[PDB]
Ligand binder design. Structure first.
Ligand SMILES: Nc1nc2c(ncn2[C@@H]2O[C@H](COP(=O)(O)OP(=O)(O)NP(=O)(O)O)[C@@H](O)[C@H]2O)c(=O)[nH]1
Ligand SMILES: CC(C)n1ncnc1-c1cn2c(n1)-c1ccc(O[C@@H](C)C(N)=O)cc1OCC2
Ligand SMILES: [Mg+2]
Lengths: 887, 176
């Protein structure tokens, strides 16, 4: 077709790793019907970037990186002078990047346009203008310039309160001064390229279930490539068994044949829309051991009941032998055809069998209708407050269902009510569709629970995704983006409402779209999801606009780092580190490598540009698997005001997904403590998995490990190390930042059960901020206390101390842990829901619901708040051999 | 501007400190823009840059206009560490500005942690002798007290040693 589309097709294939021609060959009508029906999400998003073309295109490339609430915590407001911050405005005066400055003092709640108004007042002092003259120059220029953070590519393009922007509020909490500069709108708008999205060439191309009077019967035929054995089946509605599992005959592997129909204890019309068949080939010698599993939806994406013969390539069983079936696993045939197959037949009736339309569901729900405060209210309140992992007895399930009409006064109980509905029947599921049709919207953090593997009903998903379209801000969307992308695997079909919601947001926010692309590209090696995500990236790359060119320059940059680290481990592995360096400096000084690793955007933060790299600072670290320490220069004119050298660790060979999740949880826990009034400074540094055990680690500056600090000067060495780098006046600010950072990681590592901390796992900054880096494995491997707080840390917490304990400094450190512990315990449902959405990932420590139960122990969810505190006080006393008695 | 020959010019971080209403801003605006400012705009911390030739030797001047309202009693440690020279400025019509002269002297000497540092005492607002409250001899005695050069300026339309005060501080640094 169009030679411009051929050029676009080659760039899209380079970003996603596979050519677009392979998608044109997929004969699956769902794959082709997705590539066409998804293009209107691209049209609607491009139309938003063109509505008010000057400002909207700028709002897309440089979205306002702001927080969710304009209001500030009380301890944050008290860090202000009469609620006013001092900002420092810079300006270039000579064509040699010489910069002057002038400081303003303005209210925190002011529009950036008002900051520019105060800037004109300060600058026009040598102009000798009258009161009326000052109004002219303001209203002539107030609104023709934009504030920009000095150092990076962050802008202030929207009328948000200045303190709501993340950079400004981060300055407030850290006690620093904002360094901003002015830039004319026309100079920023002229640098915005025009987006040119065109519809691709492929854009141009019964009986009701409730009339079938019979039971569900599925025929198992034979099995090839199996290399005795039986087949175990089951009908699940997303982890909940709809009927009892039945087993085939016990046949030997000589001639794998069954040729038998299996009658299930389920009426055909009573099957739900999200009904699935979960089967497996099991062995038996007693010793029942699974050999291969497989799942298939009883309905296709057109609401058609399955009928006819079909082969199902099974999947290899992962590590650990659980129940013989695997409902939580993905549904669909294995792309690798070497795996054992399984031939099946589904019962044909007369013609096509469709799921009844929504209007027919309303008819049955109206008919089955014709067929409070003393404790009923409190019990419904107590049922809702329980964690999603807590069991719900059968009596409570009927009690919720009986009061399902009163449950609309507390819409947060909806997840508990959906689990109480017997999905095996159709009279109840028909009524449940009517409630969900008019159920009051819930908080977005709560609606995310309705998107894990325990809720597959499409009408239920539609309620959660609609709750996100109203309440989920772009700030929180980027916070939970890793979970929202993982639950895309739990979707029964390619075309659903969650994928259209994430795609439209990624195409109207480049900061969202950036990490959207990389999370999908990272899992592209996994053939289980390589087609669901590959088709999603194609639609994104075809409509993201100019950013695709930036992504390609990032893909080629990471590709060259992978190739180099691959040759380094195969050719010069056992060689000494000197020999490896000579090989490194040679393969990097070549022109093709220098052009690919210079002049692209940082994947850890696209606002940070990466100009020329300082090869003399690039080194192979003395850690495990030879990580690459890379150092770029900041090409910003005012780079000195933020940072001059951008340092990133490229780690090849280790799965960094566990670090991403732990760092994401640390960031979320810090935001919990901060908004309550607990100033505990955590350091959730950047970490982005970019593929199969390859990723990037953000380097924090002026930080040193305990083992490095110990060698730079035995027990009091750490205490003296801070007094040398913090004067007698800053000493109290350094030990304070040290105690508050320890209380956070002491509580965070205990709840999550991270890897054991040692002198190389713990790092300290010059100012006294402490944090961890390793994060081997979370949850389970008498609860484990990874952060033991050795006597070296106790000396710093209690300053000059005879016994460290029985000191007000230590007593105030114990209070910081108790308040932080009960703060995270009050939000237990959130973290449990964040772990639940990660089960579909390849996380070896997040496969079953038993691993998520670890935080239920460390948080003591079954005990009262008084008892849960005494619990935490015991493991600290046991791990420290005293100091936490107080009895 | 004025394009300087050679390259890598010396840069002098001259810091102007003194109480409020003394005239630190008006002196700096006069030296950089050749204009007197009569209005009341309390300064938090502003910087000014210029290339000028002093004693036939080009140099870059980074002049920092500090605060005086004492509300910003911080930030002092910053410019009192990176500053190459200091300009102690007091007002001859404000007695309170004269007592704080040695208040800034012990700060600069302690923060620098040296026996002495390039400083110049500036008696400003001498154009208002009808309300002058500090004689020339009182400024001379304070200047010889801390072994500091002395100069009387007035940022008013008559120039009066505005450029000389800065240029002398650049001279002190070159011969310190
Ligand atoms: N007559 C006269 N007025 C002067 C002179 N120098 C400064 N002033 C006046 O003194 C007032 C304050 O001057 P300013 O330069 O703001 O003083 P400052 O020492 O910078 N104060 P702050 O540190 O609070 O900004 C203004 O009214 C200004 O016009 C001078 O030489 N003569
Ligand atoms: C072993 C390693 C690659 N690693 N493995 C899993 N996580 C990490 C990891 C994560 N960070 C770091 N290491 C890190 C290291 C060094 C560093 O500064 C250097 C100068 C130092 N003090 O020697 C600053 C750092 O910043 C925190 C982020
Ligand atoms: Mg001033």
């Amino acid at each position: 077709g169009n030679r411009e589309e051929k050029i676009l097709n080659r760039e899209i294939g380079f970003a996603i790793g596979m050519p677009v021609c392979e998608f044109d060959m997929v004969k699956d009508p769902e794959v082709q019907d997705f590539r066409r029906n998804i293009l209107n999400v691209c049209k609607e998003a491009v139309d938003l970037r063109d509505l008010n073309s000057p400002h909207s295109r700028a709002m897309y490339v440089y979205p306002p990186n702001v927080e969710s609430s304009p209001e500030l915590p009380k301890h944050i407001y008290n860090k202000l002078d009469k609620g006013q911050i001092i900002v420092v405005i810079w300006v270039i005066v000579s064509p040699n990047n010489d910069k002057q400055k002038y400081t303003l003092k303005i209210n925190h709640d002011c529009v950036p346009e008002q900051v520019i108004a105060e800037a004109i007042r300060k600058k026009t002092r040598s102009m000798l203008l009258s009161s009326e003259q000052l109004k002219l120059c303001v209203l002539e220029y107030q609104g023709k310039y934009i504030l920009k953070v000095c150092g990076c590519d962050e802008y202030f393009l929207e009328k948000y309160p200045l303190s709501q922007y993340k950079y400004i509020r981060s300055c407030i909490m850290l006690g620093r001064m904002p360094n901003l500069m002015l830039m004319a709108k026309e100079s920023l708008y002229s640098q915005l390229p025009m987006d040119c999205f065109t519809m691709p060439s492929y854009s141009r191309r019964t009986k009701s279930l409730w009339v079938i009077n019979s039971a569900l019967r599925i025929k198992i035929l034979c099995a090839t490539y199996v290399n005795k054995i039986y087949v175990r089946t089951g009908i699940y509605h997303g982890g909940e068994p709809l009927c009892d599992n039945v087993n085939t005959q016990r046949v030997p592997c000589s001639n794998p044949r069954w040729n038998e129909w299996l009658n299930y204890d389920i009426y055909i019309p009573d099957l739900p829309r999200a009904a699935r068949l979960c089967l497996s080939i099991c062995s038996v010698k007693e010793e029942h051991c699974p050999l291969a599993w497989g799942n298939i939806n009883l309905f296709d994406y057109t609401d058609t009941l399955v009928s006819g013969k079909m082969a199902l390539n099974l999947w290899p069983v992962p590590h650990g032998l659980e129940d013989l079936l695997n409902p939580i696993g993905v549904t669909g045939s294995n792309p690798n055809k070497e795996t054992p197959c399984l031939e099946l037949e589904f019962d044909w009736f007369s013609s096509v069998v469709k799921f009844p339309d929504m209007s027919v569901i309303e008819e049955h729900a109206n008919w089955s209708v014709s067929r409070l405060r003393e404790n009923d209210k409190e019990q419904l309140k107590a049922i809702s407050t329980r964690d999603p992992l807590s069991e719900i007895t059968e009596q409570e399930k009927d009690f919720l269902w009986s009061h399902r009409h009163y449950c609309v006064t507390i819409p947060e109980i909806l997840p508990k009510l959906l689990l109480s509905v017997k999905w095996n029947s159709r009279d109840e599921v028909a009524q449940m569709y009517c409630l969900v049709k008019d159920w009051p919207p819930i908080k977005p953090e709560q609606a995310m629970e309705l998107l894990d593997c325990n809720y597959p009903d499409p009408m239920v998903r539609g309620f959660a995704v609609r709750c996100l379209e109203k309440y989920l801000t772009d700030d929180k969307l980027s916070q939970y983006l890793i979970q929202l992308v993982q639950v895309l695997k739990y979707e029964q079909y390619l075309d659903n409402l969650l994928v259209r919601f994430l795609l439209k947001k990624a195409l109207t926010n480049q900061r969202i779209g950036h990490f959207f692309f990389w999370h999908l590209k990272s899992e592209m090696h996994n053939k289980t999801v390589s087609q669901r995500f590959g088709l999603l990236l194609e639609s994104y790359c075809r409509a993201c606009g100019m950013y695709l060119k930036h992504l390609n320059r990032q893909v080629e940059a990471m590709e060259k780092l992978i190739n180099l680290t691959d040759i380094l481990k195969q050719e010069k592995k056992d060689e000494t580190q000197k020999v490896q360096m000579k090989f490194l400096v040679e393969q990097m000084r070549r022109p093709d490598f220098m052009d690919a690793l210079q002049g692209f955007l940082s994947p850890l933060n696209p606002a940070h540009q990466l100009g020329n790299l300082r090869l003399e600072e690039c080194r192979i670290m003395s850690s495990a698997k030879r990580p690459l320490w890379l150092n770029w220069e900041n090409p910003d004119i005012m780079s000195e005001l933020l940072f001059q050298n951008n340092e990133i660790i490229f780690k090849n060979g280790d799965d960094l997904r566990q670090d991403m999740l732990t760092l994401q949880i640390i960031r979320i826990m810090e935001n919990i403590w901060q908004n309550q009034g607990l100033d505990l400074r955590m350091l959730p540094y950047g970490c982005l998995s970019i593929g199969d055990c390859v990723g990037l680690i953000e380097v924090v500056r002026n930080s040193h490990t305990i083992m490095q600090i110990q060698c730079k000067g035995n027990s009091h060495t750490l205490h003296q190390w801070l007094k040398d780098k913090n004067k007698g006046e800053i000493y109290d600010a350094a030990i304070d930042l040290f105690t508050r950072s320890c209380a956070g990681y002491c509580v965070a590592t205990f709840i999550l059960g991270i890897g054991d901390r040692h002198n190389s796992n713990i790092m300290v900054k010059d100012d006294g901020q402490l944090f961890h880096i390793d994060f081997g494995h979370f949850l389970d491997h008498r609860e484990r206390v990874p952060f033991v707080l050795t006597q070296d840390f106790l000396i710093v917490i209690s300053k000059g101390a005879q016994e460290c304990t029985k000191t007000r400094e230590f007593e105030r450190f114990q209070e910081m842990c108790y308040k932080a512990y009960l703060a995270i315990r009050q939000h237990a449902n959130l973290f449990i829901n964040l772990f639940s959405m990660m089960l579909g990932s390849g996380m070896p420590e997040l496969q079953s619901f038993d691993d998520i139960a670890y935080i239920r122990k460390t948080l003591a969810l079954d005990k009262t708040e008084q008892e849960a505190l005494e619990y935490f006080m015991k493991q600290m006393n046991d791990a420290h051999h005293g100091g936490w008695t107080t009895k | 501007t004025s394009a300087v020959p050679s390259d890598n010019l010396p840069t002098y971080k001259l810091v102007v400190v003194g109480d409020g209403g003394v005239g630190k801003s008006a002196l700096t605006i006069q030296f950089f823009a050749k204009i007197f400012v009569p209005d009341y705009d309390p300064t938090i911390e502003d910087s000014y840059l210029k290339h000028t030739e002093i004693d036939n030797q080009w140099a870059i001047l980074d002049v920092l206009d500090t605060a005086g309202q004492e509300e910003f009693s911080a930030m002092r440690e910053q410019y009192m560490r990176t500053g190459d020279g200091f300009l102690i400025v007091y007002s001859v019509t404000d007695k309170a500005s004269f007592e704080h002269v040695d208040r800034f002297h012990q700060l600069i000497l302690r923060v620098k942690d040296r026996e002495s540092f390039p400083m110049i005492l500036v008696a400003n607002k001498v154009d208002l002798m009808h309300l002058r409250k500090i004689t020339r001899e009182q400024g001379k005695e304070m200047a010889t007290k801390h072994n500091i050069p002395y100069i009387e300026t007035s940022a008013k339309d008559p120039p009066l040693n505005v450029d000389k005060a800065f240029h002398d501080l650049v001279r002190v640094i070159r011969q310190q």
